[PDB]
Design a protein around this ligand. Structure first.
Ligand SMILES: *[C@@H]1O[C@H](CO)[C@@H](O[C@@H]2O[C@H](CO)[C@@H](O[C@@H]3O[C@H](CO)[C@@H](O)[C@H](O)[C@@H]3O)[C@H](O)[C@H]2NC(C)=O)[C@H](O)[C@H]1NC(C)=O
Ligand SMILES: *[C@@H]1O[C@H](CO)[C@@H](O[C@@H]2O[C@H](CO)[C@@H](O[C@@H]3O[C@H](CO)[C@@H](O)[C@H](O)[C@@H]3O)[C@H](O)[C@H]2NC(C)=O)[C@H](O)[C@H]1NC(C)=O
Ligand SMILES: *[C@@H]1O[C@H](CO)[C@@H](O[C@@H]2O[C@H](CO)[C@@H](O[C@@H]3O[C@H](CO)[C@@H](O)[C@H](O)[C@@H]3O)[C@H](O)[C@H]2NC(C)=O)[C@H](O)[C@H]1NC(C)=O
Ligand SMILES: *[C@@H]1O[C@H](CO)[C@@H](O[C@@H]2O[C@H](CO)[C@@H](O)[C@H](O)[C@H]2NC(C)=O)[C@H](O)[C@H]1NC(C)=O
Ligand SMILES: *[C@@H]1O[C@H](CO)[C@@H](O[C@@H]2O[C@H](CO)[C@@H](O)[C@H](O)[C@H]2NC(C)=O)[C@H](O)[C@H]1NC(C)=O
Ligand SMILES: *[C@@H]1O[C@H](CO)[C@@H](O[C@@H]2O[C@H](CO)[C@@H](O)[C@H](O)[C@H]2NC(C)=O)[C@H](O)[C@H]1NC(C)=O
Ligand SMILES: *[C@@H]1O[C@H](CO)[C@@H](O)[C@H](O)[C@H]1NC(C)=O
Ligand SMILES: *[C@@H]1O[C@H](CO)[C@@H](O)[C@H](O)[C@H]1NC(C)=O
Ligand SMILES: *[C@@H]1O[C@H](CO)[C@@H](O)[C@H](O)[C@H]1NC(C)=O
Lengths: 89, 423, 100, 50, 50, 44
């Protein structure tokens, strides 16, 4: 889940205090809470491996279900393979 | 029989600014109409699924805006890089290429464009939020950089297959053949052309720097969406016939049977305000989509190729274009060949030699008063009229305005010299 | 109803300028300074554009001019005799009048 | 191995008609809704900046 | 309704401007863009609202 | 890629060798001149 426009600290506090309006909860364990510009993403592990965008989240971040069993991950999307052209005179 | 032919040329760089994307908004229908009020929400439910349609319309717009940005900039299969040595025949691209010393890695012109146009919902906290774009400004700059590196190092080949390196002056030579000017014009004047290009780029920076209105097209989009949201928020203070614009005051002072009447008056007013806002956003979204489609077409035809469509890729004969990223849009720098310093010559449709009518193969016959020459149409370069330059069709009695002049046969001259002595 | 910024005379003047440019300078006035060219040579270039050699135009110049003049007369007869020819513009006028 | 090649040609002139502009209208919102009526105008003000 | 028609007219005007630049101020190799047949040239004429 | 011999039919001449940047030295084959040295090589 993505809580739009909010700091993860504020969401974590709202969960701790039993203040958050929706009554369902996401496990929210260590390393599954990731701060994006879109909002606070809970339930996906952020990795440093870029891939093609699958499910867009926002602000450069996409998520996908990958084998690493399988889980939902978040990553900064890749724009393409790099190709340095052998330019010369 | 009077024709004017350019004897010089100018390399001109012009700027075209197009919107690509719109601010992506999202509205919590229930909070806006019935903010934190159960009684209002329960009355709101009697109007059916209007909040749901409004939600879909705004979601569809947000998705479309990301589609528009992706369609305009993500036109390159790979992210291309320039060589470590940025020498391109004397053409200085340092003001359009990424500046590696600054954060965000934007070119000097992109940095200027971003500075000229002006996440946390500090403002308008009435259920109205803004979603970030899927591609960040850095990602757009990276696509622009890839497109620019592709054009500079591979010309038009990266847009129709694998990138193929070509020396930049030869790319320009091909572009000159495209407009209809021979390759030697570029090579003979390569230094002049590079200097005119570099000067024109400096003028682009001075024009954008000194003219506040240069980017008005993008600022208008920002201003119109900001005004639309400010108006939408302002409608909340209206009473619409109710005793008060604040639901907490209505519920605080009145019993449910009266509060429902005052609340329904407010629900009607707020719901009409949201329908007006969404309808206007759909119309503007359609306008932006059309602009984005034009920008994508221009990207493909001006940047990833050479276009023979008049005024499509700037004023003049199109040579090449370079994209630059801008907030909510794209700026194209169009490099064109503009004829200059034309000279007034006498012409003729054909030359009559021995009864044959000679027509030019690639050019126009001109006369500098006393002598006839064949020249390329777009650049004065007189050449001797020979059987290699012309073709023969028919006799001299058909063409209107045919003039009498010698056509030189290159081989016959040899026949009279090779065995002039017989032995 | 507000009047347009350009009057019908100003539009006619722009149309006249564009037509004079095309007739006396061909395509050159649209990409730089206007360069005069004899009209039959402009047509010869246009023939090379479509992929027909210049001698076809010069050998048949009188036929081509006659076919052009005939076609223009037919345009006037078509517009004069067909009330529906300009329906696209009349529909715009009718729709805004109906809306008001 | 059969090809057809034109031996003559016709110069043809056709007509394309396109709208460019629309009648420019202007509406006095207050006169239309509340023509020369102060009481109506004052009630109209409660609908905000429509 | 006026905003929707205005958008339609804008699209038509943009097409007309494109045709002016490519058909009148040049020679187009786009099939059927500047009339039926191989394009040679075009001439504009003014018309009410178009 | 379809390499062909560089001849006076494939190229055109404009100016001298001291203007173009990066010009290289290579033979350009004149098709007619070769005949002139074979057709009457023997003089009679
Ligand atoms: C390609 O063109 C750029 C200009 O568009 C050339 O940049 C030049 O960079 C040097 C060093 O940064 C500048 O020198 C100094 O600039 C400051 C102002 O920032 C000035 O106060 C100093 O007196 C000094 O001039 C230089 O001005 C700048 N050139 C221009 C025209 O502004 C770059 O060198 C060119 N590259 C090649 C390979 O020719
Ligand atoms: C075609 O036009 C170009 C200009 O677009 C001509 O080149 C220009 O020639 C003038 C006179 O030779 C140059 O002016 C001189 O520049 C030096 C610079 O140090 C200055 O010290 C002199 O006092 C004078 O102002 C001008 O710079 C030069 N421009 C460029 C961009 O190279 C060219 O000669 C023309 N060609 C023909 C065939 O007429
Ligand atoms: C190619 O087609 C054109 C027509 O598009 C041919 O020209 C036409 O030829 C006919 C017969 O020669 C002409 O008809 C005659 O016209 C005179 C006019 O005074 C009339 O008195 C005769 O009774 C007869 O009707 C016709 O006018 C002429 N059309 C044009 C526009 O010139 C041309 O001959 C054809 N070429 C080839 C190679 O077949
Ligand atoms: C037209 O061009 C011809 C050829 O360039 C000019 O005649 C040449 O003039 C130069 C001197 O400038 C002489 O060295 C050549 O021998 C001349 N060639 C011939 C074939 O006569 C001619 O003067 C030019 N005329 C005008 C009016 O500009
Ligand atoms: C081009 O040269 C031809 C041949 O010299 C000229 O044709 C002659 O024109 C005179 C005009 O009085 C006639 O009397 C001759 O009978 C023609 N001879 C031939 C062989 O056709 C022709 O007039 C010249 N054209 C121009 C434009 O000067
Ligand atoms: C191409 O060949 C020419 C002629 O052989 C070379 O020109 C000579 O270059 C040397 C360089 O030291 C000069 O000293 C001679 O005076 C030049 N001769 C002439 C006739 O110009 C030229 O350098 C060769 N080019 C290349 C790239 O090797
Ligand atoms: C969240 O709040 C902390 C302070 O509690 C702050 O340091 C951090 O930058 C904030 N993050 C965002 C994304 O606003
Ligand atoms: C191309 O030539 C220039 C001439 O100054 C030289 O500086 C540059 O290094 C050369 N480029 C390559 C890739 O060798
Ligand atoms: C072109 O040259 C002729 C002389 O050859 C001259 O009479 C005419 O005036 C010139 N054209 C212009 C526009 O001056």
């Amino acid at each position: 889940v993505l809580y739009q426009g909010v700091n993860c600290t504020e969401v974590s506090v709202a969960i701790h205090a039993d203040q958050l309006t929706p009554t369902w909860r996401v496990y929210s364990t260590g390393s599954n809470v990731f701060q994006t510009r879109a909002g606070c993403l809970i339930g996906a592990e952020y990795v440093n491996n870029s891939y093609e965008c699958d499910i867009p989240i926002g602000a450069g971040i996409c998520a996908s279900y990958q084998t690493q069993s399988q889980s939902i991950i978040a990553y900064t999307m890749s724009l393409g393979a790099e190709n340095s052209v052998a330019y010369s005179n | 029989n009077s024709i004017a032919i350019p004897t010089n040329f100018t390399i001109s760089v012009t700027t075209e600014i197009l919107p690509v994307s719109m601010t992506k908004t999202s509205v919590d229908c229930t909070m806006y109409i019935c903010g934190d009020s159960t009684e209002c929400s329960n009355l709101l439910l009697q109007y059916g699924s209007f909040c749901t349609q409004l939600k879909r319309a705004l979601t569809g717009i947000a998705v479309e805006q990301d589609k528009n940005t992706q369609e305009v900039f993500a036109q390159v299969k790979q992210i291309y890089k320039t060589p470590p040595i940025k020498y391109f025949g004397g053409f200085n691209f340092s003001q359009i290429l990424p500046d590696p010393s600054k954060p965000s890695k934007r070119s000097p012109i992109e940095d200027l464009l971003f500075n000229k146009v002006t996440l946390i919902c500090a403002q308008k906290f009435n259920g109205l939020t803004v979603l970030p774009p899927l591609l960040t400004d850095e990602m757009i700059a990276q696509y622009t950089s890839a497109l620019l590196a592709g054009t500079i190092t591979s010309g038009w080949t990266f847009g129709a297959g694998p990138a193929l390196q070509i020396p930049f002056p030869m790319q320009m030579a091909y572009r000159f053949n495209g407009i209809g000017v021979t390759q030697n014009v570029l090579y003979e004047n390569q230094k002049l052309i590079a200097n005119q290009f570099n000067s024109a780029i400096g003028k682009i920076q001075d024009s954008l720097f000194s003219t506040p209105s240069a980017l008005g097209k993008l600022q208008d989009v920002v201003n119109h969406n900001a005004q639309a949201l400010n108006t939408l928020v302002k409608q909340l203070s209206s009473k619409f016939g109710a005793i008060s614009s604040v639901l907490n005051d209505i519920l605080s002072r009145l019993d449910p049977p009266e509060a429902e009447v005052q609340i329904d008056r407010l629900i009607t007013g707020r719901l009409q305000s949201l329908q007006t806002y969404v309808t206007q956003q759909l119309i503007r979204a359609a306008e932006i989509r059309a602009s984005a489609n034009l920008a994508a077409t221009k990207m493909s035809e001006c940047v990833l190729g050479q276009s023979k469509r008049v005024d499509f890729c700037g004023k003049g004969y199109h040579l090449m274009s370079f994209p630059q990223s801008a907030p909510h849009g794209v700026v194209f720098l169009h490099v064109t060949y503009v004829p200059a310093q034309e000279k007034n010559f006498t012409t003729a449709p054909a030359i009559c030699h021995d009864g044959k009518a000679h027509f030019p193969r690639e050019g126009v016959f001109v006369s500098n008063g006393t002598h006839w020459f064949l020249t390329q149409r777009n650049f004065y370069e007189p050449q001797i009229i020979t059987t290699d330059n012309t073709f023969v069709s028919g006799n001299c009695d058909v063409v209107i305005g045919i003039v009498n002049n010698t056509v030189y046969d290159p081989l016959q001259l040899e026949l009279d010299s090779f065995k002039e002595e017989l032995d």
